[PDB]
Amino acid sequence: MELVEVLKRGVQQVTGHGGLRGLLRVFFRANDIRIGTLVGEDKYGNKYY
Amino acid sequence: TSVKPIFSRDLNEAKRRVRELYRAWYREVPNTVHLMQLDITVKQGRDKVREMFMKNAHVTDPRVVDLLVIKGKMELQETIKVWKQRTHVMRFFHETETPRPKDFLSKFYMGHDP
Amino acid sequence: GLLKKTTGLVGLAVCDTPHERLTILYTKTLDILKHFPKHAAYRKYTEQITNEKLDMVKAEPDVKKLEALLQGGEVEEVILQAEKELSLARKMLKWKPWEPLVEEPPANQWKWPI
Amino acid sequence: ASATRVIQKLRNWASGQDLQAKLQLRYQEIAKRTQPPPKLPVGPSHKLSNNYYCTRDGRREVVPPSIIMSSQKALVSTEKKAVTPAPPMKRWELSKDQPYL
Amino acid sequence: GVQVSPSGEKITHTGQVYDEKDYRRVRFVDRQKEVNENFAIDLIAQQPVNEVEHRIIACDGGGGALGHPKVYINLDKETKTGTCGYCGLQFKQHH
Amino acid sequence: KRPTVRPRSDVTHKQLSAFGEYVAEILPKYVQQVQVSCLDELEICIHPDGVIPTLTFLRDHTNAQFKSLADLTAVDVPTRQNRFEIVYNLLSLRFNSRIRVKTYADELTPIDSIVSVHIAANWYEREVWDMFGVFFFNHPDLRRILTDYGFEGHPFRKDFPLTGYVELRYDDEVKRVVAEPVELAQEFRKFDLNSPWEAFPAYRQPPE
Amino acid sequence: REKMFEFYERVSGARMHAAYIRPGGVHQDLPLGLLDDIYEFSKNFSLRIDEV
Amino acid sequence: VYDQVEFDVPIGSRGDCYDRYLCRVEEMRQSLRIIEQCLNKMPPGEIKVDDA
Amino acid sequence: KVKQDMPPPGGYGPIDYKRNLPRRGLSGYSMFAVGIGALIFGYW
Amino acid sequence: TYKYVNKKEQESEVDMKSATDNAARILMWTELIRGLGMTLSYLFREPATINYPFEKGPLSPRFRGEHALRRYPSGEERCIACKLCEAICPAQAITIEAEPRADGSRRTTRYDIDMTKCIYCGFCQEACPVDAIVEGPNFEFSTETHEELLYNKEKLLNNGDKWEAEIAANIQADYLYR
Ligand code: SF4
C-alpha cells in the first residue's frame, strides 16, 4: 500500500519538469529529477532550488 | 696538538684503509655497470672512482681520513645494495652541467663572480 | 594465596616461588657489593635499597601483600628489576664511576645562551 | 528519513540495530546557518586600576636553571638516604564503569 | 583611469607598461594583460569634502571595527583640507 | 591566583634537585654539571666517556629505572669548540619522571652508540649522523636515514644553507632526474627581527 | 570524518590544517551553535562504531 | 584539563595486532565519554591569555 | 549581556558510548534440527 | 582507571548446550552471516552522496579560500602597504613594494601572492590592520598552468571587485568573533 505512495511521488517527479523535453533536459544535464521549491534565478539563467 | 684517534693512530695506518676501500670500489664498478645498465664503460667507471679519491689526496689528518673512508664505505654500501638508482650514480658525472671556465677573461665576460 | 594465572604483561611469565627467587637475587647483590670500595656511593645506596627490600620479603609471606610493600608492580616485575640491579653492579665494578671526574669541559661548554 | 516502513523494518532487522533513531544523514536537528551575533567576554586583565603589568608578567619571572652541582664553580660536596626521582606511581584501579570487554 | 601606450598596451594604475621593444610583451600574445579598471586614486578624488564644526575630527573609515584604526585629524590650516592617512577622506572646518 | 601566569610548585623542584645530587654522587667520574630548571626538568651534563655507564645506570638502577628513551638528538652551537651537544631524553614509568642527559662532541670526536642500552637509539643515532655528521662507535648499521642517496653534507648544521647547494630536475636530453647547482627565482628574504632593547634582565650577560 | 572536518572548518576556516590551537589558547571562540552540532554528532557515533 | 575528566585506558593482554585493534576501538568509545564531559563543562570567558 | 556558545541549562542528554551488539539467532539445537530435517526429507 | 579489551579468560566448563551453540557458530558461519546483514542494511539506506556541482558541501563564513584585496565603500584601496601580512606570512608567499602615490597616499606598487607557495593559513588576514587582504570564499580556481597562480596586484584587486558582495557578508557574520 505504501509502495503506491512511493510510485505516485515518482510520477510527480517524472511529470513535474515541463513535459518530456523538460524531464530529459534536467535528467541528462543534472542526472537528477527531484522537484524543489524555486528559490530564485540570477541574471545569467541559473535557477536555485 | 694532542687529539683522540678515531680508528687510525697515524696517516700510515689510515692510508691502509684508503687502499682497502679503493680495492672494494674498484671491484664493484663492473658489477654496478652491469646490474644498473649504465651507459658507460667499466674503464670510465674506474676513472671516476680514481678522480673521487684524488679529490681528497691533500688530506693529512688521520681522523679526517678515517671519516672520509667511513663515508666512502657507506656510499659503496648503497651502491652494492642498489639503494642508489641510476640517477644517483650518474650524478657523479655531471652530464648536463656546463663547467665554469677557469681563466680570468672568460669569467670576466660571463659576470661578476670570481 | 592462590597462584597467579598471568602477570598481565606480554612476555613476563609467572614465578612459582617469588619469595625464594627474590631472596636469591638480593643476597647475590649484597655479595657483589662487598667487592666495591667502602666509600663508593653506588655501594652504600644500593646496599640500603637492597636490604630494605630483602627485609620486606622476610617480613611478608603473602605475595599480594608483598607487592603492596615493594611498590614495584607485579612480583615478577620486581624479580626482573632485581636481576637488572645485579647485572648493573657487575658492570659498575669494572667502570669504577666512583673515581674523580675524568676531565673538565671547556669553560663555556654548558653556558646557554651563548 | 524517507524510507518506507517496510524498508525500515528490513534494514533494522538486517543490522540488528534501531537505525531510525540514529541516522547518519543530517536533517533539521542541526544549527541554523545564520546565527545571532555573539558578544564575547573580556579577560581578567580588563581592569582600569590595580592592574600594573609588572604584577602579572610571567615571562619576566623565568630564571636560569639552579646549578645543583658544577665541576667548575659549585662543589656538590648519619648515612644519607637513597632517593628516587619521584615517589613510585600508584597502581591504576580497575574501571568500575566496565572493567572487561 | 586606464589609458593605452603607443604600442597599444593598457597602462596600469601603478604606471606599468612594457616598452615597445620589450620582448616580455610576448606573454600577452593570444592572451591578455590583466588590468583592474577601477583606479582608487580617481574614486577617492570623487568623494566630497566633509564639513565639520570642530578643529579636530576623528576618522575610523566607517563601519566602526570594520574600518581602520581611529585617527585624529587637525583642521586648523584653512588653505587645505585635512586628509585621512588611512582611507583618504577629506575634512574641512566650517569656518 | 594570577590567572595569566603559569602556576608553580616547589615539590617537584626539590625532588628533582635531590635526585640530581644522588646521580652526581654515584657517577662523579663523568658528571660535569647538574641543574634543575624553573620548568622543573633535571639535566645531567656528562663527559662523553660516561655515556654508556651513565645511561646504563639510569636504565637499570632500582631507584632510577629510566627504561624508555623518549628521543635522542643534537644541537649545533658553532661558537663552542665542541659544537655538537648530544641530548638524551629519558622516561621512567616506575617513578613517572623524566630526565635529560647531555654530552658534547665535535666534528672529529665520535660518541659511543647506546644501542646496547636502548635499541630505540638505533635510528636516532642514524638521524644524528645524517643531520649533524657526528659518528657513533659500535653502531650496528650506521648510514644516512633522512637525506637523499649520495647527499653531501649535514643539513642541520648551522652553517649549511637553508636551501642547500644542489637542486633536482628532470632533463630530457639524458632522460633522467639530474642534480644542478641551486638557482632560485625568488631568493629567501632574510628578516632582521631582534629588538635592540633587552627583553629579559634575568639573563643579562656580564658587560665584559 | 567528513562531518568532523566541518567542526574544524567552522572554528578555523580550514577542514584540516586549522592552525587553531596556539600558545596562549585558541585563535577564536566557538561559533554559536557549534556545541549543539558536536552533540548531535556525538550521540550517534557509538552506533557507527558498533557497525564496524 | 585532562585531570578533570573521567575515562578509562584500554589495556591489551596479548600484545598482537588484534589486541591493538581492540584498544583503538575502545579508545574511540572513551573519547566520546570525554567529549560529553567537555560539552557539559564548557566554561565561559576568554579564549586566549589576557596578556598582549 | 555576554553571549557565547555554551551548553544548554541542565546539560546535554546522555551519550551512548559502550559497545552494544545485539544477541540474536536460534539455539544450536534448532539450527541443527532444521538442517538435519532438510537432509532426511531430501534423502527420502 | 583502566579496562581490559581482551581478558575474558574466566575459563569455565562446557555443557552440551554451549558446545552445540559453539558447534553451530563454527559450522554454519553465523557471525559471517551477521556481517552480511550489516552490509545488506546499508544497501537499503539512502546514500550520503551529493550531486556535485549542482549541490555543494556546506561551508562557513570563516572558510579560507582564494585571496582578494578589498576597498573602502568609496572605492579607495584599504591596503596602506604596512607589510604586516608580508612579515607574518609563514611561507614568504607575499611580496610588496610601495611608494607615495601621485596624491601623496601610502600605497603599494607591487602586491604579489605566490599561490603555489601559500599555505592558506589566514595569518595575513589576521595581521592586516585594515581588513585589506582577506581569504575569500572561492575554492574553485584550479588552472591549467603554474604561471596563472602567481597573482599580482591587478589580479588580487579584481578578485576583490569580483567577490566583495560575498566577502563583505562573511565579514559581517564573523568579525565579532575577531
Ligand atoms: S594564507 Fe598564510 S601562507 Fe598564504 S599568503 Fe596569507 S599568510 Fe601567507
Ligand code: SF4
Ligand atoms: S594587505 Fe594589510 S597587512 Fe598587507 S601591506 Fe596592505 S594594509 Fe598592510
Ligand SMILES: [Zn+2]
Ligand atoms: Zn579614514
